[PDB]
Structures are given as C-alpha cells and as structure tokens.
Write a protein that binds this ligand. Structure first.
Ligand SMILES: *[C@@H]1O[C@H](CO)[C@@H](O[C@@H]2O[C@H](CO)[C@@H](O)[C@H](O)[C@H]2NC(C)=O)[C@H](O)[C@H]1NC(C)=O
Ligand SMILES: *[C@@H]1O[C@H](CO)[C@@H](O[C@@H]2O[C@H](CO)[C@@H](O)[C@H](O)[C@H]2NC(C)=O)[C@H](O)[C@H]1NC(C)=O
Ligand SMILES: *[C@@H]1O[C@H](CO)[C@@H](O)[C@H](O)[C@H]1NC(C)=O
Ligand SMILES: *[C@@H]1O[C@H](CO)[C@@H](O)[C@H](O)[C@H]1NC(C)=O
Ligand SMILES: *[C@@H]1O[C@H](CO)[C@@H](O)[C@H](O)[C@H]1NC(C)=O
Ligand SMILES: *[C@@H]1O[C@H](CO)[C@@H](O)[C@H](O)[C@H]1NC(C)=O
Ligand SMILES: *[C@@H]1O[C@H](CO)[C@@H](O)[C@H](O)[C@H]1NC(C)=O
Lengths: 241, 110, 229, 117
C-alpha cells in the first residue's frame, strides 16, 4: 500500500507512515528491478534481513526525476532545502522509480506542488503545510497576491513529452532508528528442516546445544516451551514450526 | 525561454585555446548539449549533459557549467575545428517552449 | 467528563489473603520436582483491601498488583494505568468490553471520574482526547489477575475459577497461568479500575506484591499443586 | 541506423507541401523523431518532436500550423499556408536511446524547400 498505491503525496506534502510490529522482507525489494534507484547508507541492504529495528518510518512523495539526486544526506538543493531535508546521520535510504505512465498527463499533470520560497532553510525531517505568500518587499502584502508578493508554491509541468530528468519520479524513503526500547521489526530469520535420531547441533528459538532429538511421549501445557530435569537439563519439545 | 551564446565569433592560432559561454534564461539543471556544424554538413553532437563527451569525439573539447551558465573550451584547436558550434538545453515544459537552440558561434583558425 | 459524588464514604475493609496468588514464573516444564524460586510474590496469609456500592479511587502501583473480583454481571470492565493520566505523558488503557479486548498505550485526556454507562451501553466518557499514539492491540465465578512491569515489559497472568462462597476470598489453592505480554517501556506508578443512570453492586480485592522466596510442587503433568512460603 | 528524408520542391506561397523521413536499421516505435530547420547561413531552429508513444510537441514560433505524423516507416511533416520566409533546409534527427529526449545524434542528409513565384 506504500510502494505502489493509487495516490502518492506531494514533495512538499510528503506522507509519513509508521511501520512497527511488522515482519519485514527486504529480499523481495532487493531482487525487484522495477525501482530505478535503490542504494542505502549506514547498513548494506544485503544484511537488512538480519538487523532488527524498533520502528521504521516510510515517507512517500513524487518529485522531479532530475531532483532525485538532491534527496541524500548532506545534499543542498531546492526541494532538499525547502521541501524535504535529510539529516546528515540519516539511517536508511530511498527507493525511487520513474512514474511517467501514471503521474503525468497529456495536458500536464498540475496536481503536484512544491515550495520555491520560504523564510530560511528548514531543519531535517520537517513538514511544511502553510501556504503563506512569500513577500519580498518592505510593505506588508496583507496576504494578497500582486507585485513583489510571490507565491511560494508552484506546480510541476508533468507531460509525456518531457525528458527523463523532467519525468515524475515516485520516491519512498525508509528510515530506521533504535533507542532504549524493544525491537520488533525484522525478518522471519530461517528454519532449516529437522532431523531425528542423529547427533546434531540444534538451535531452538535462541537456545543452542548438542544432542540427539528423538520423538517424545509426554504432555506439556499450551504456554510451556522448554523442558527441564532434576538439575537444569534442557529437553526441548515445542517446535517453533 | 531564451538561449544566449557568447562571443558571436572568435579566432585563435593552432597552438591556442578558446572558450564559448552558453547562458539559459531559466534553470535547466545539467540538461544541455553542444553541436558542431561544418559548412554544408548536418550538426554532430559533441557533448551531451554538458559534461559527457559523445562517442567518437576527441578529448580536446571539454564542457563544464551548471544551472544557467555553461562553458565549452577547446584545447589545442587544430585546422579541422573551423566550424560553427551551437548549444541547446531542455527548458521545463508547458511553462516555456520545450527546447530552444542558441544563436551559435563561428571559429576560424589561422 | 461526568462528575458524580453520590457515594457513601467509608474506610475500606480488609480480608485475609489465605493462599492465593501463585503464578508460573516461566514456561519451564517439570514433573514431580520441588523447585525453589526467589521473585516477586504476594505473601501468604496477608491482609488485602476489599473495595466496594461504587468506590474506585486511585491506587499506587508500587511493584505489582494482585487483582481479584467475583460477581455475576461483570460490572468491572477494564483498567487504566500510568503515572499522571493527564495526557502529558504515556498512559496505558485496557478495556475488556463485550466485543473484544482493546489495548492502547498513548496519552489520553482522562477525566477525574472515568466510567462506563449502561440494557444498552450509551456512555463512553473515560477520556476526551488522545494524540501521538504508539501501540494498539485487539484480541459464582472469581477472576484473579497479576500485573507486573519488569525491564519495560508488561506481564498479565489470569485465571478464572468457579466459587460457591459469598463474601470472602475462597479458602483454597489455584495456580495462575501467564496470559499476555506487552512490549512497552513505560515507568508506571498508579492505576484505576473500571465499572459499568443506575447504580450497581461490586467489590474487588487488591493486593500488593513484594520480593520473597517460594517453594513450589509440580505434579506428574507439570501443574502446580502446592506452594510453601 | 540510417535516417533519410525527402520532399524538397519549389512551390508558390500558400501551397501545402509534405516531407517524408524514412528510417532504416532500428525500431521507430521506441525512438523519438524530431524536425529542425535552418535558414541559409543562419542559426538552427526547432520545429517539433514526436515521442515513441505518439504524443506530439510543437514550437511557439510555429504558431501551430505544422502537422507531424508517424506510421510504420515514414515520419512525415505537412505544412499549410507557406510564406516567402520559409525557404530553409529541413532535417529529421534520431535520438540516443530510450528516453533522453532532445539529443539529435543521427541526422538526415538535408533537403531544401524553397518558396517563390
Ligand atoms: C505492487 O508491487 C508489488 C511488489 O511486491 C507487486 O507484487 C508482485 O509483483 C510482481 C511483478 O508484477 C509479481 O511477479 C508478483 O507475483 C507480485 N506478488 C504477488 C504476491 O502478487 C504488485 O503486483 C504491484 N502491483 C501492481 C498493480 O503491479
Ligand atoms: C469535575 O470536578 C473537578 C474537581 O471538582 C474539576 O476539576 C477542576 O476543573 C477546573 C476547571 O477545569 C480547574 O480550574 C480545577 O483546577 C480542577 N480541579 C483540580 C483539583 O485541579 C473538573 O473540571 C470537573 N469536570 C466537570 C466535567 O465538571
Ligand atoms: C506453520 O506454517 C505451516 C505452513 O503452512 C502450517 O502448515 C502449519 O500448520 C503452521 N503451524 C503453526 C503452529 O502455526
Ligand atoms: C490485617 O490488616 C491490617 C490492615 O493494616 C493490618 O494492620 C493487620 O496487621 C492485618 N492482620 C494480620 C493478622 O495480618
Ligand atoms: C510522541 O511520543 C513519542 C514517544 O512515544 C515522543 O518521543 C515524541 O516526542 C512525542 N511527540 C509529541 C509531539 O508529543
Ligand atoms: C520513572 O518515571 C518517571 C515518570 O514518573 C520518569 O520521569 C523517569 O525517567 C522514570 N525512571 C527512569 C529511570 O527513566
Ligand atoms: C495428568 O492428566 C491425565 C489425563 O490427561 C490424568 O489422568 C492425570 O491424573 C493427570 N495427572 C495429575 C497429577 O493430575
């Protein structure tokens, strides 16, 4: 619903979604070639399936293609400084792809707006919605459009005849963070097949050991997981599968 | 909407270098190309994206610039470089007239 | 929300704890093994408060709560937990309504007298505002519960039993099995129960836990049959 | 990839004339053909472009009196109400690859259209 939906937010009005209590799968996106650019900072996307994060933030927007370079840590641009600013120590990355077939119109798709003028460069990860008229003269414009009273918001001319730099590009930025809180977001790990009646090195749910695992005839309780003997001897029963 | 090329004409010796400036009335990012038109021959694209040398062209031609100002410099101009050069850049869309061509410059080597 | 003061003031009664409030500390299975543990428990033969009519004042959450209740109409519905309960900080919320359990953890503009109205329920005035949320969750007889918070984890142990007594904690033994875990790192100090115009009759017993040492006997099937302070 | 064109003739003002560009060695449905012109001894002028999908773009100075059409192997351009200042040389130019519009790496030999009495 975030990677490919019917409505994506604007660059200046980007949409934030919180991903938590999710079992994410980063292998499918790594293998998918439908995305134009996907390269990430701090953590290699190959090993994203291993690291577990407490919460993830996905911000979706549609920008100009030539502007996809501006969306990076320590980058200076127009939409970078006035619409979406990234922190220098940003953890995560963006996934961007050309979307001229959906986000452009024959007469020009004018539903996408971006801010050109504002008081000063905004802090990273800040949302601006106010459409106050940017005044450049000494006299107060009184919020009335006219001379020397510029409108900061302007619409992109998305047309199929434009170049690849001017084609609309759908970008979803994934940001990962951790703090003194339990982590919940990570992959499904892996479960190799089980073999019986053979001396094996087992790892059940984070408990490791060596021994032979035979079929057993004993009754547990639904919530019970491990097994024990008269002195701290593990007899694991509950298969995680 | 307006592309400007300076100077209109300039000459230099064989063992010399010259520069050409192309200015755009609007921000065009780096989407700018150059051409060389010999007398009676169709133009040949020399540099595209204002910094990438085209296939089969020499390395004595270099391009730089970004935004609204671009510069093409020729080093050790030979007698074969005597032709006309033009700059072209993409200009947004609906706002302006798609693409436009520059006025061009003439180069003659003594 | 709604301010109601038609309550007859009275100091709360006390009743003997007897031998209630033994819970399985973990998922380990043992058979015919007498095991010695040291953990937070309710001391045996203690005196616990017996609240009552309508009486639902704030009760501090020192280290853990043993909450018991017996009734026939389920007037008790849920619980509020937290520290300030003024939406200025995090505040747990659990409602075991007729439909299903609903659990939230964010800040709520709790009023001084939250309650539920009832027969068809019409009134829902426990809180007025809720912003910046973090977690959500939807899932003759005596109900016994134990609530604890350790290392930023919330543990709920529950047990339902049939009783024949009238106005006291039945004299017997019954182990408490773990039910639910919540992964939320909230520092917590206080809580308040729920009740469901017209006034009904309800009474719930509250007991406070402390660090102790216990001995537990497991039977052939691993169920706890007896315990020793 | 060879791109050629033809249609040069001497015509009176106001007489429509069509010019056909023939491609060879590539697929037209993937690449964008464009029209440019230059006056004798003057600078280059841009006429229009047709994208591979089929959408059309023109120039403001043209005022909207050109018409560029596409088919199997004939990118054709038609004119109405010729004036005496349209005497120039026309070319059809190809692109580098998918996308990357307005590059013009391959050009036609060149044809001259003259208007006089
Ligand atoms: C939206 O993106 C998802 C990416 O997971 C697409 O799901 C897969 O798409 C590929 C390519 O079309 C298929 O080969 C897979 O079979 C799809 N997976 C499943 C589970 O169906 C999804 O198709 C995309 N939506 C649309 C409308 O294309
Ligand atoms: C219910 O009663 C309480 C206390 O009588 C009210 O709380 C007071 O509210 C006023 C105005 O909101 C504050 O100025 C006081 O400081 C509050 N009391 C305290 C002790 O802080 C509450 O507003 C009443 N609610 C309704 C709905 O009448
Ligand atoms: C685990 O998933 C498999 C996959 O279909 C299923 O057959 C099995 O019943 C599941 N078992 C549990 C305990 O969820
Ligand atoms: C009964 O409860 C009261 C309440 O404070 C307490 O003081 C008293 O010691 C308790 N009696 C016994 C025998 O525990
Ligand atoms: C929202 O709550 C989180 C903790 O869950 C906190 O870090 C953040 O500062 C809060 N934001 C606001 C605006 O209250
Ligand atoms: C305990 O809770 C209080 C809020 O009542 C909080 O300010 C404090 O930080 C918590 N303790 C620790 C160690 O965080
Ligand atoms: C264990 O369960 C069996 C039947 O499930 C029952 O016959 C037996 O009495 C139980 N053990 C104990 C100690 O109650």
């Amino acid at each position: 619903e975030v990677f490919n939906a019917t409505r994506f937010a604007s660059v200046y009005a980007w949409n934030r979604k919180r991903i938590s209590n999710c079992v994410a799968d980063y292998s499918v996106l790594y293998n998918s070639a439908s995305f134009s650019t996907f390269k990430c900072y701090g953590v290699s996307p190959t090993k994203l399936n291993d690291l577990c994060f407490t919460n993830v933030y996905a911000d979706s927007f549609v920008i100009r293609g030539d502007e996809v370079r501006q969306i990076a840590p320590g980058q200076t641009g127009k939409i970078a400084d006035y619409n979406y600013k990234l922190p220098d120590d940003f953890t995560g990355c963006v996934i961007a792809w050309n979307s001229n077939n959906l986000d452009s119109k024959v007469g020009g798709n004018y539903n996408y707006l971006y801010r050109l003028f504002r008081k000063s460069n905004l802090k990273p990860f800040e949302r601006d919605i106010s459409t106050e008229i940017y005044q450049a003269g000494s006299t107060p414009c009184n919020g009335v459009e006219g001379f020397n009273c510029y409108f900061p918001l302007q619409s992109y001319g998305f047309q199929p005849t434009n170049g690849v730099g001017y084609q609309p590009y759908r970008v979803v930025v994934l940001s990962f963070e951790l703090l003194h809180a339990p982590a919940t977001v990570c992959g499904p790990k892996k479960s190799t097949n089980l073999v019986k009646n053979k001396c094996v090195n087992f790892n059940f749910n984070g408990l490791t050991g060596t021994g032979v695992l035979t079929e057993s005839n004993k009754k547990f309780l639904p919530f019970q997981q491990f097994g024990r003997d008269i002195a701290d001897t593990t007899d694991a029963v509950r298969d995680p599968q | 909407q307006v592309l400007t090329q300076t100077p209109s004409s300039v000459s230099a010796a064989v063992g010399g270098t010259v520069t050409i400036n192309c200015q755009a009335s609007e921000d065009i990012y780096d989407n700018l190309v150059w051409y060389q038109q010999k007398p009676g021959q169709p133009p040949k694209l020399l540099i595209y994206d204002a910094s990438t040398l085209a296939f089969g062209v020499s390395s004595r031609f270099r391009g730089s610039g970004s935004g609204t100002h671009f510069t093409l410099t020729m080093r050790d101009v030979q007698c074969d470089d005597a032709a006309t050069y033009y700059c072209q850049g993409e200009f947004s869309c609906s706002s302006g007239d798609c693409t436009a061509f520059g006025g061009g410059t003439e180069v003659v080597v003594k | 929300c709604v301010n109601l003061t038609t309550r007859t003031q009275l100091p709360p009664a006390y009743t003997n704890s007897f031998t209630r409030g033994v819970y399985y500390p973990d998922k380990v299975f043992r058979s015919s093994v007498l095991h010695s543990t040291q953990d937070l428990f309710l001391p045996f033969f203690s005196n616990v408060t017996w609240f009552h009519r309508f009486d639902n004042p704030v009760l501090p959450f020192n280290d853990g709560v043993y909450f018991a209740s017996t009734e026939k109409s389920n007037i008790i519905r849920g619980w509020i937990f937290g520290t300030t309960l003024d939406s200025k900080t995090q505040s747990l919320l659990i409602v075991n309504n007729a439909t299903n359990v609903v659990i939230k953890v964010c800040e709520f503009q709790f009023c001084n007298d939250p309650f539920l109205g009832v027969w068809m329920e019409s009134e829902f005035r426990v809180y007025s505002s809720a912003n910046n949320c973090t977690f959500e969750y939807v899932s003759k007889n005596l109900r016994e519960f134990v609530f604890k918070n350790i290392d930023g984890y919330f543990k709920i142990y529950s047990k339902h039993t049939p009783i024949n007594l009238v106005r006291d904690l039945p004299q017997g033994f019954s182990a408490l099995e773990p039910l639910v875990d919540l992964p939320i790192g909230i520092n917590i100090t206080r809580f308040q129960t729920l009740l469901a115009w017209t006034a009904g009759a309800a009474a719930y017993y509250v007991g406070y836990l402390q660090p102790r040492t216990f001995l537990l006997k497991y039977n052939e099937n691993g169920t706890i049959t007896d315990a020793v302070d | 990839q060879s791109v050629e064109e033809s249609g040069g003739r001497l015509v009176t003002p106001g007489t429509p004339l069509t010019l056909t560009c023939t491609v060879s060695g590539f697929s037209l449905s993937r690449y964008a053909m464009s029209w440019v012109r230059q006056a004798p001894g003057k600078g280059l002028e841009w006429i229009g472009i047709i994208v591979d999908s089929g959408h059309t773009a023109y120039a403001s100075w043209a005022k909207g009196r050109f018409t560029i059409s596409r088919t199997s192997t004939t990118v054709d351009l038609k004119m109405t109400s010729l004036t005496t200042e349209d005497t120039a040389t026309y070319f059809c130019a190809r692109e580098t690859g998918g996308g990357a519009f307005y590059v013009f790496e391959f050009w036609g030999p060149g044809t001259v259209v003259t208007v006089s009495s």
